[PDB]
Paper text:
[name] and [name] are the enzymes responsible for the in vivo glucosylation of SA in [name]. In [name], glucose is transferred to the hydroxyl of SA, creating a glucoside; in [name], glucose is transferred to the carboxylate group of SA to create a glucose ester. [name] exhibits the GT-B fold with ligands bound in the cleft between the two domains –the N-terminal domain is comprised of residues 1–245, while 246–449 make up the C-terminal domain. [name] and SA interact primarily with residues in the C- and N-terminal domain, respectively.
We crystalized UGT74F2T15S and UGT74F2T15A in complex with [name] and SA or [name] and 2-BA. As the findings with both mutants were identical, we will present further the structures of UGT74F2T15S. The [name] and SA complex structure of this mutant is very similar to that of the wild-type enzyme, with an overall RMSD of 1.4 Å2. In contrast to the wild type enzyme, the omit map for SA in the binding pocket of UGT74F2T15S does not have clear electron density for the 2-hydroxyl of SA, despite the higher resolution of the latter structure. In contrast, UGT74F2T15A and UGT74F2T15S form both SGE and SAG; UGT74F2T15A has wild-type activity for SGE formation, better than UGT74F2T15S, and both mutants form about 5-fold more SAG than the wild-type. Therefore, we propose that SA binds to [name] primarily in the conformation described for the [name]/SA complex (i.e. carboxyl group of SA interacting with His 18 and Thr 15) but binds to [name] primarily in the conformation modeled on the basis of 2-BA in the 2-BA/[name] complexes of [name] wild-type or [name] (i.e. SA hydroxyl interacting with His 18 and SA carboxyl interacting with Thr 365). This explains why UGT74F1S15T and UGT74F2T365A behave like wild-type enzymes (no carboxyl group from SA to interact with) while UGT74F2T15S and UGT74F1T365A impact product specificity (both mutations affect interaction with SA carboxyl); the latter mutants can accommodate both binding modes of SA. Therefore, impairing the recognition of SA carboxyl group in each enzyme decreases the product specificity.
Author numbering: 5 to 446
Write the structure that this text describes.
Amino acid sequence: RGHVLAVPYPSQGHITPFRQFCKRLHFKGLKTTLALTTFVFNSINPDLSGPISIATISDGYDHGGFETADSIDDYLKDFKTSGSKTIADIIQKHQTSDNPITCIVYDAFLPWALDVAREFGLVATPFFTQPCAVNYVYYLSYINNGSLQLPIEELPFLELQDLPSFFSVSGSYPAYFEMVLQQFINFEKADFVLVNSFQELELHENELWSKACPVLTIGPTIPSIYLDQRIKSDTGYDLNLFESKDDSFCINWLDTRPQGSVVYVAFGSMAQLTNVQMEELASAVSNFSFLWVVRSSEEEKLPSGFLETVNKEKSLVLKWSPQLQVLSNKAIGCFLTHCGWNSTMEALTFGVPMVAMPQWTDQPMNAKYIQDVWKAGVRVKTEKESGIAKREEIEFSIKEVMEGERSKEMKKNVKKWRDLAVKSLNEGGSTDTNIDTFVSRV
Ligand SMILES: O=c1ccn([C@@H]2O[C@H](COP(=O)(O)OP(=O)(O)O)[C@@H](O)[C@H]2O)c(=O)[nH]1
Ligand SMILES: *[C@@H]1O[C@H](CO)[C@@H](O)[C@H](O[C@@H]2O[C@H](CO)[C@@H](O)[C@H](O)[C@H]2O)[C@H]1O
Ligand SMILES: *[C@@H]1O[C@H](CO)[C@@H](O)[C@H](O)[C@H]1O
Ligand SMILES: O=C(O)c1ccccc1O
């Protein structure tokens, strides 16, 4: 008779793994309530794929969300204040109910949630939505104090341009940098540490980070239908902040294309590219058959007249994609990606080789593992005066994944991950066992 209150950070790349993890807990017999901010809750269009219980909380920006904050530091500060009160509201209200909350799974970005869980005598477990290698680097910085020493002794192959953007773009995003460092301020006092990865994907880094902490890999959070198929209702991502266009057009359009012919291009839910970068992309893209996601707020930055000179026989532009169905479609030749962790793990488990074009935060690390560890893609060369990828380098990287000699080797190397993820989610696998360890304790 346990009840987990799950609290993601209010963004798509964090709500999705949290929701998928709750579906796994429901399948194991554990009730969950998902705590969403009021702005996010009123932004979702509910087409559910499974049972869901949602409580709303506040970050202090119910009306406008993050865009109405004065600054990133004010947003996180108000969210700790408002979010701590409204999380406590849910726990207190449920204390006289059939199933009082017994545990808080909270986003590692929000370590103040452990203070609330302690105040009510609850089990507390941070949930890291980024891979073990990224988190371990941040842990090493924190136990120093905000500084990392290259080379990292137990990971000597990493260079400065492989690190999270906060290290290589000096002074960038100081409040977000303090946030990722402060994920470890009280993890000492946490019962477990949960991570959206699976052990066979980063054995070395999972082993290293586990010496410091009790870490439980519980991923990948990809819907059950694509992998182990143990959860029959888990057919897709069902908490979308972005309207889905009514997905059939894009997937009908992909079915007409020859196998491996389409270059899929997407940058996640919040990355913003410059006009100069959009033009180098739009030029490089146009030498190929492509499916490119440009979010509605980014359409301004494409060259004027572009969305009409597209060749509609071979190519298509969307505001948002059904990315899971896109990546499982065999018209896809390769994935030009910003290397957000969900998109990386989705590309890996589906066997789609990548052109890595990291933009910031943990993306450079994922780009490095994509190219040099998993050997499932190549990283675009960026010119150093700008940080920008020129169209000729973007085109070279696409062709290297689409057709070169290492292209054939990268396709077989990435096809191994599906069965390893499936094995991990099935009975007796590392993730399935780690979920049972967590459920037993709760
Ligand atoms: O057009 C799109 C682009 C992204 N995604 C989903 O949005 C999530 C993006 O998370 P990620 O960690 O890759 O990037 P972030 O948005 O956090 O930068 C992923 O689950 C993708 O499958 C989608 O459904 N349609
Ligand atoms: C972190 O700061 C960045 C700006 O540097 C914000 O864009 C980001 O806000 C996210 O933006 C998404 C839309 O692009 C929303 O889906 C998400 O809820 C919101 O958190 C900040 O988190
Ligand atoms: C932070 O800056 C990056 C570029 O470095 C951009 O991709 C994001 O949109 C912004 O939040
Ligand atoms: O939403 C994310 O994926 C994210 C990742 C790193 C830093 C800040 C963020 O909002």
